[PDB]
């Protein structure tokens, strides 16, 4: 039985997760063991750099967070939570945390490196994805959310900017900066404006159904090349989202439109993923009729795109200014990050 196999798989995954969640791993490397290659991304907290593990020659994406900046930006809980989730999860489409450590100034998370880069870059380059291309990525997200939701984790920041592509053309969910492990409802205003479910905008209690709404936004943006609700400023985007109105490009198939009407559903008692049959309402939808869910999970499906090569191995990535990694002689924010 396929259904009893799903139940047994998830029961084992929860047992594995809870063991790691209760006793997280800490201090599994040191900065002196890595060579910096290039900055891949910069933000408020700090940055992500491509690095080489000197002992093996393996490459990784190292997230560097300045402890003082994290404290100033009120991100202590978010930082500790992101690391705690990353070390406890295990799914083929979730980025692996290889090592983590801290020094006087910084927190370090050494992650699996995804050389295919952002889905965002490819989507804006190509304009839009064909429906089979969009469907392949959408199927990965469905399975990822079925896994995360089973562990009572709400993701809350789905967007092309967050979805990396690996060597096999498969996507990888990477950023857990807003994910929360909660059973009932939650109230925080977080996420990205275009991707917010109306109940988030309206300050109502919300649950895992917000991720199914964000999936609708993602599918739409992938298939259209632009999101369903956009405007000059976030407040104007919120107005469109809460309106209860959506328009589709003429090239969208009838099946795609029907799936999107069920995901981009204001009414929580009607939203797909949130009904009695849960995720099976999405998995069994006509738009996914050609999807072999087990073959996607087993990574047996040939990806629609497998990532012009210029000088070096980072030639297709944007150029960030290479800034120093300063390690103060004084320990900063020791008590705040003792669990890291």
């Amino acid at each position: 039985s396929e259904q009893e196999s799903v139940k047994e798989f998830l029961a084992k995954a929860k047992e594995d997760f809870l063991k790691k969640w209760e006793n997280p791993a800490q201090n599994t490397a040191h900065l002196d063991q890595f060579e910096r290659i290039k900055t891949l991304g910069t933000g408020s907290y700090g940055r992500v750099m491509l690095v080489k593990h000197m002992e093996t020659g393996n490459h990784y994406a190292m997230k560097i967070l300045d402890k003082q900046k994290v404290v100033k930006l009120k991100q202590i809980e978010h930082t500790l939570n992101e690391k705690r989730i990353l070390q406890a999860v295990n799914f083929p489409f979730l980025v692996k945390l290889e090592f983590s450590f801290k020094d006087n100034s910084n927190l370090y998370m050494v992650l699996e490196y995804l050389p295919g880069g952002e889905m965002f870059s490819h989507l804006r380059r190509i304009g839009r994805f064909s429906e089979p291309h969009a469907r392949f990525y959408a199927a990965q997200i469905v399975l990822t959310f079925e896994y995360l939701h089973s562990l009572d984790l709400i993701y809350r920041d789905l967007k092309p900017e967050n979805l990396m592509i690996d060597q096999q053309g498969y996507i990888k969910v990477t950023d857990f900066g807003f994910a929360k492990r909660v059973k009932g409802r939650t109230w925080t205003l977080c996420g990205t404006p275009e991707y917010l479910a109306p109940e988030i905008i309206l300050s109502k209690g919300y649950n895992k159904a917000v991720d199914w709404w964000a999936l609708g936004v993602l599918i739409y943006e992938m298939a259209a090349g632009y999101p369903p609700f956009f405007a000059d400023q976030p407040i104007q985007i919120y107005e469109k989202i809460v309106s209860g109105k959506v328009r589709f490009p003429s090239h969208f198939s009838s099946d795609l439109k029907d799936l999107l009407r069920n995901l981009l559903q204001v009414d929580l008692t009607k939203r797909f993923g949130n009904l009695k049959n849960g995720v099976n309402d999405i998995k069994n939808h006509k738009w996914f009729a050609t999807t072999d869910w087990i073959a996607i999970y087993q990574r047996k499906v040939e990806a629609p795109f497998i990532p012009f090569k210029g000088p070096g191995d980072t030639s297709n990535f944007d150029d960030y200014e290479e800034e120093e990694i300063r390690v103060s002689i004084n320990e900063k924010c020791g008590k705040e990050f003792s669990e890291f």
Binding site: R124, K159, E161, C190, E194, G225, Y226
Partner: peptide
């Protein structure tokens, strides 16, 4: 067109979380 409106929005670049 909707595509022209998307370009005019000025939110075609990478979007930050709130």
């Amino acid at each position: 067109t909707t595509y022209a409106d998307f370009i005019a929005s000025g939110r075609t670049g990478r979007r930050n979380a709130i």
